[PDB]
Swiss-Prot record, chain A:
Role description: Attaches the virion to the cell membrane by interacting with host receptor, initiating the infection. The major receptor is host ACE2. When S2/S2' has been cleaved, binding to the receptor triggers direct fusion at the cell membrane. When S2/S2' has not been cleaved, binding to the receptor results in internalization of the virus by endocytosis using host TFRC and GRM2 and leading to fusion of the virion membrane with the host endosomal membrane. Alternatively, may use NRP1/NRP2 and integrin as entry receptors.
Glycosylation sites: N47
Phenotypic consequence of A14D: In strain: Alpha/B.1.1.7
Range covered out of full length: 557 to 606 of 1273
UniProt name for this protein: Spike protein S1
Biological source species: Severe acute respiratory syndrome coronavirus 2 (2019-nCoV)
Lineage: Viruses, Riboviria, Orthornavirae, Pisuviricota, Pisoniviricetes
Domain of life according to the entry: Viruses
Assembly, per entry: Binds to host ACE2. RBD also interacts with the N-linked glycan on 'Asn-90' of ACE2. Cleavage of S generates a polybasic C-terminal sequence on S1 that binds to host Neuropilin-1 (NRP1) and Neuropilin-2 (NRP2) receptors. Interacts with host integrin alpha-5/beta-1 (ITGA5:ITGB1) and with ACE2 in complex with integrin alpha-5/beta-1 (ITGA5:ITGB1). May interact via cytoplasmic c-terminus with M protein. May interact (via N-terminus) with host bilirubin and biliverdin, thereby preventing antibody binding to the SARS-CoV-2 spike NTD via an allosteric mechanism.
Length: 50, 49
């Protein structure tokens, strides 16, 4: 992505900032949420096996 | 070849933010005088009328 000289932050569809400009260096880097997901557990039946 | 404001869309990027902190009610435009105020020419001394 390319930021106009007045632009600092970035956004998508919500309040959370999708991309961001570092104060120390003009380079811009995008942010993605740290991995999440539902741990579903499979089993063949405690009666049958553990 | 458009005398008046053209038909179209152009977005105005921000230029500058001055912390002047003053009160503003009226404004005027500064112009460049190419001709001479002491001696005004009959015509063409200025910029094409
Ligand atoms: C497991 O199920 C079988 C029937 O399919 C039954 O005979 C057995 O007693 C059960 N074992 C336990 C530990 O529940
Ligand atoms: C600015 O000046 C006008 C008078 O011309 C006055 O009515 C107004 O209250 C002033 N505003 C501020 C913010 O000082």
């Amino acid at each position: 992505k390319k930021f106009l000289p007045f632009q600092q932050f970035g956004r998508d569809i919500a309040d959370t900032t999708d991309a961001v400009r570092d104060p120390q260096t003009l380079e811009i880097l995008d942010i993605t949420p740290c991995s999440f997901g539902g741990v579903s557990v499979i089993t063949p039946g405690t009666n049958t096996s553990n | 070849l458009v005398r008046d404001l053209p038909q179209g869309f152009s977005a105005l990027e921000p230029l500058v933010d001055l912390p002047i902190g003053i009160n503003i009610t009226r404004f005027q435009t500064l112009l460049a005088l190419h001709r001479s105020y002491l001696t005004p020419g009959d015509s063409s001394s200025g910029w094409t009328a």
